[PDB]
Amino acid sequence: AQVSTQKTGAHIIHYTNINYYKDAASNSANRQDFTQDPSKFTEPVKDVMIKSLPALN
Amino acid sequence: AQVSTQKTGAHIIHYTNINYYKDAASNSANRQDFTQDPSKFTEPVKDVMIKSLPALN
Amino acid sequence: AQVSTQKTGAHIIHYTNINYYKDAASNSANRQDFTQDPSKFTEPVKDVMIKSLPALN
Amino acid sequence: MGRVADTIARGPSNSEQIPALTAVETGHTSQVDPSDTMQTRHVHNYHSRSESSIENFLCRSACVIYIKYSSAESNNLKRYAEWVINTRQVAQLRRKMEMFTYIRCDMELTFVITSHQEMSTATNSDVPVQTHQIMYVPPGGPVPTSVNDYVWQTSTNPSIFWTEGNAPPRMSIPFMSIGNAYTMFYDGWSNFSRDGIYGYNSLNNMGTIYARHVNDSSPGGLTSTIRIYFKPKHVKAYVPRPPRLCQYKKAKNVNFDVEAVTTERASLVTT
Amino acid sequence: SDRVRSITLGNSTITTQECANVVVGYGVWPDYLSDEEATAEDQPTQPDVATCRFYTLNSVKWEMQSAGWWWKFPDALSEMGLFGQNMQYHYLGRSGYTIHVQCNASKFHQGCLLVVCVPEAEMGCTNAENAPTYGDLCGGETAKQFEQNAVTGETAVQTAVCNAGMGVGVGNLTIYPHQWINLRTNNSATIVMPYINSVPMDNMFRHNNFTLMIIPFAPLDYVTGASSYIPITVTVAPMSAEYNGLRLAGHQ
Amino acid sequence: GLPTMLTPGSTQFLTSDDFQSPSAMPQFDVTPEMNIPGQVRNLMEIAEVDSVVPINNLQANLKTMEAYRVQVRSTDEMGGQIFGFPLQPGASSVLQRTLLGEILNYYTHWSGSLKLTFVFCGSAMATGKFLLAYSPPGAGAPDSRKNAMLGTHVIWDVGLQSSCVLCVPWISQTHYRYVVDDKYTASGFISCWYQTNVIVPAEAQKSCYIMCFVSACNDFSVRMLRDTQFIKQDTFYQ
Amino acid sequence: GLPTMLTPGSTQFLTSDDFQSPSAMPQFDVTPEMNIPGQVRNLMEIAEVDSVVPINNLQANLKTMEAYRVQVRSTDEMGGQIFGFPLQPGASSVLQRTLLGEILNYYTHWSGSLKLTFVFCGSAMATGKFLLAYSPPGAGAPDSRKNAMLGTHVIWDVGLQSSCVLCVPWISQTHYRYVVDDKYTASGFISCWYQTNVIVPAEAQKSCYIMCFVSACNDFSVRMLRDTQFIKQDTFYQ
Amino acid sequence: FCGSAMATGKFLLAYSPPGAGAPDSRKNAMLGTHVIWDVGLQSSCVLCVPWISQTHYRYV
Q1: Among B22, B26, B27, B32, which would you mutate to test the A interface (most chain A Cβ atoms within 10 Å of its Cβ)?
Q2: What stretches pass through the bilayer (chains A, B, C)?
């Protein structure tokens, strides 16, 4: 069994999950992954632009 | 699993609770919290009044 | 309980199986055995034939 | 976990650093905080971007078609379903998946099957509970042509049997595609001559779902209806796209009719 | 300064003296296919400096009533150089790009362009019962051009900017890699696209990886007596091209 | 067996659930992953990207390209107010069909600062200053430049740098504001004025254009899904 | 008891499931195993075995033995193309009733190299060379020997060794190709030509025969079952 | 470039090795080695022809 933290709200809190099937496509959906990386739609430029400097020197 | 005491009556007595969901709003209601603090509706006064003394000196 | 790996896809992943019956013909089907031996329908010859050599010397 | 950035205090400034000026002559969008145009205060900020993931965005079930079929042929409903799988019938589920160019995911198909009696001249009508079969024929298999034929033996085809009154039947479909992701927009053609079908419908080829009443027809007959629901799981969506502005026309094309960018205003200055 | 760049690929070079950076599309610089993501079991030819090098597509006149242009790739390089002779002898290919749009103008001219590389731009059709004929998507080296107002044809592409010929708001083409050529700052835009597709390589002729679009967002305007013809020239250089699955000439 | 009972709600189908369910092809070998560029992991990687705002949406500009640009020009007085609209993305006509309005119309709550980045598309000999402004609700839109500068404001000066970012602050009595228009949780007003004038030489045009972009800041978040109301159908497409 | 609820799909019968179910004869003593020769453990131990290919299936050869052999003969010109058929096993008429076509028609995906092994059944004084070839799709079948040798090819020389293996490579833009004929994922063409000629002495026959075999290589695999469409019935046999 | 300081333009300088004659269009001229000169503050640009010969010396 895998024991994982619940969605907790800010100011027990565990839940147990056991996978019962032989395929990994039968597992319940991920919803605990909150990873991001904005800087490739937001700052796709080749040379770094520093915020405090003018963009075009 | 969390093991907690039941409501016992005065003159085993355990129960096991496992939370199955990923939200903490799906947990069964608290009913084992009996904390109080009467003295703020009952004695809201700034300066302590001692019972045995007259209130107004 | 027997804990075994699921079918995973390439680039958790465990499952637990408990047998509940007294006969071994009531167990769920094997599907994790991928053993082979092609060389007896494919190379049934008495004397080994090496690929790089001509078959008939 | 994921949480929003905190606001950080700053005092007045009068320096030769300009955060506010930028040049949007580059793909680089400004990265200014509200801590760069006015003083602000330290705010420890606990908001989470936990419902704006792509596995919370796309991970709710949505209807994708209903097919009707009958036990007596009510009015051109045949005695079996048929429906070539695609996500393009609706405008709900479709729009959210045409907001990404490529998606790989593992569906959960849930069927919600209901029935109603027909208008008929039959009297003293009592029907036992219906059992419905839902068969999935992967592309290139044999296709049924009648209510009873050899194709419904389901010799290797996935199939669900379900009896009314029970909970909706569901299953998981793993990521199954030739590609390394499903393609939601294809700019090519089927042929190498740039002829034939154009668009995403060239690549679409996901088989067909048939369904029928298992039970032999009763005298009154019924009309059943099946609603398919797809719920993505384990979703990785690559390459975002602007969402649609226009109503769809067809389920094999993107054809559109020219439509307004935005709703009217009276003037430039409106309170 | 930061206004000067030089790009050398092959035996070609292109230089600028008013420039705003380079936008690497999705932050991935093009490179050869790995052996963990391969799927074709034969040696890929990699011509290198014989196909990676700037090619120049036909220049288009920016009028004051122009509504934009588009070139689908790699169908605009089908006739260019030895790049175009290795799409006709191979079943597969992949290749990044480094589209460089350039368009100088005086300091008394004004106007603004949006240069944007749209992966998998699937165009509409004027008739909603038809899908557009080949000649109306691609012109080769010659751009097909947007129209200001909605057009009615039959097999004609629905060209109205306000929908961008795709039925999406034209102002929302910005998640796609882009730069703006605004004639009071830069005069060039450089977008380095990687290979973006859902399969590791794909047939060059059949499938179009992306579609460049240049859309005026503020019309060209000038006080008369000034230059009345300013062209927009698009050069594009393949990057890390490799082809595989050699077969006879053609694309029949 | 194990004696168990069935709690309320147990043959239900809830669309927002996640439960395990048996695979319909056991031991299926999924196709390998590859790194396709530009994986999206969150929709604040699409809502933090600039999108042109149609701030000149009148009634004849809606199907043209004239929507996205507002004409600013040399004046012989002082010039009034270039434009102004109530802030309230995803329910304001101006902001609701951008990328911070068609990604907020899948939600019913939003929070955090957003920012508007203006850009000047005039000639390179034209110059001018403009007072960008934001006034928190509770007084209506400012009706003069005198009242507009009491709010938060940024004086934009057109120079070599062609763009200037009015970053609206948060400022709310709730942690989230409804996406839909609600009078309880009004979000204030944006207005833009001539600080000076557009002054331009004889041999260049007296008309320029300002365009507006909109993107969220890195403190922005949303909650609680709902289907968008910008799309509709009468029947299945076929 | 234990309070449990029943998730969706729970009185269903799914044909592809595996669950435990109570025995109908408890404590049954199964008969001992013995080693019967030739245990099959996988169906790539049947699909990697040569099977004669009917490459001369016309319309009068289908119920004779003439199906399995194509006549190659001495010519007084150069001779054209002995045979050629589109590769696409399990959907090509040529290859679909062999052992790599009736073991692929229980699947809807296939991958990996296969190989064709030709054999010359001429006299022992007859000799000749033949250019075997495979051309990847995207140009149609080659129409001359000049175009046929641009594809992968093997020049077979008939010597003491009587057989030569054209091992077609994989080469695909997908990891699997559909078993059924699909224009998306065409699998190219096989063609065979006279490299030289069959030259044979006076007192031996001018007609020989070539037969073709087909087997999969050791990199071959399939996925996803479906029932075969080569068998049918109208009613139960009784 | 000896133009005015408000004049600007680009020019494609080119060198084509022998064996095809002079290029007769800009399309053929850019297949040779070439340098796109952009007139800016820097007023000069150097097309450096490479060597490229099948002999170590060429006759004058």
Answers
A1: B22
A2: none
- Distance separating the N- and C-terminal Cα atoms of chain B: 58
Tell me whether strands F129-135 and G189-194 are parallel, antiparallel or unpaired. Answer: unpaired
**Tokens, residue A37:** 């990386």
Residue D153 lies in domain: 1-271
The domains of chain C are located at 1-57
CB E132 within 8 A of CB E155: yes
For residue G20 the two structure tokens come to 């435990």
Q: Which of D265, D256, D225, G205 is nearest to E132 (CA)?
A: D256
List chain E residues with CB under 8 Å of G135.
Answer: 247-248
Among E16, E81, E104, the residue with its CB nearest the CB of H8 is: E104
Give CA–CA dist G79/G91, Å, rounded.
29
For E188, phi then psi, to 5°, come to -155, 155
In sequence order, the β-bridge partners of residue G133 are G153, G191
Q: Coil, strand or helix: which one is D13?
A: coil
Q: Please report, for residues D37, E117, G74, G79, the alpha-carbon distance to residue G198 in angstroms, rounded to integers and kept in the order given.
A: 90, 59, 5, 10
What backbone phi and psi angles, to 5 degrees, belong to H36? -85, 120
Whether D132 has its CB under 8 Å from any CB of chain F: the answer is: no
**Smallest Cβ distance to D174: which of A25, A34, A36?**
A25
CA E208 to chain centre: 11
Q: At H27, which helix (H) or strand (E)?
A: helix H26-29
Instruction: Note whether C46 contacts A: Cβ–Cβ < 8 A.
Output: no
The answer to whether C30 faces chain A, any CB pair under 8 Å, is no
Give the number of other Cβ atoms within 10 Å of residue G6's Cβ.
Answer: 12
Q: Which of G150, G171, G173 sits opposite E248 (nearest CB)?
A: G150
CB half-sphere exposure, G83, CA atoms < 13 A: 22
| Sequence-ordered strand ranges (E) for chain F | 4-5, 39-40, 51-53, 70-73, 81-86, 107-111, 114-120, 129-135, 152-157, 163-167, 189-194, 207-216, 221-225
Asked whether the bond before E74 is cis by omega within 30 degrees of 0, the reply is yes
Chain-centroid distance, C-alpha F71: 21
Q: For residue C42, how many other CB atoms are within 10 A of its CB?
A: 16
Q: In the structure encoding, which two tokens stand for residue E50, read together?
A: 């014989």
- CA-nearest residue to F158 within chain E is E184
* Structure's resolution in angstroms: 3.4
Token output for E212: 């460049």
Pick from F111, F114, F112, F108: nearest CA to F182: F108
Q: In angstroms, rounded to a whole number, what is the distance separating the alpha carbons of residues D106 and B47?
A: 67
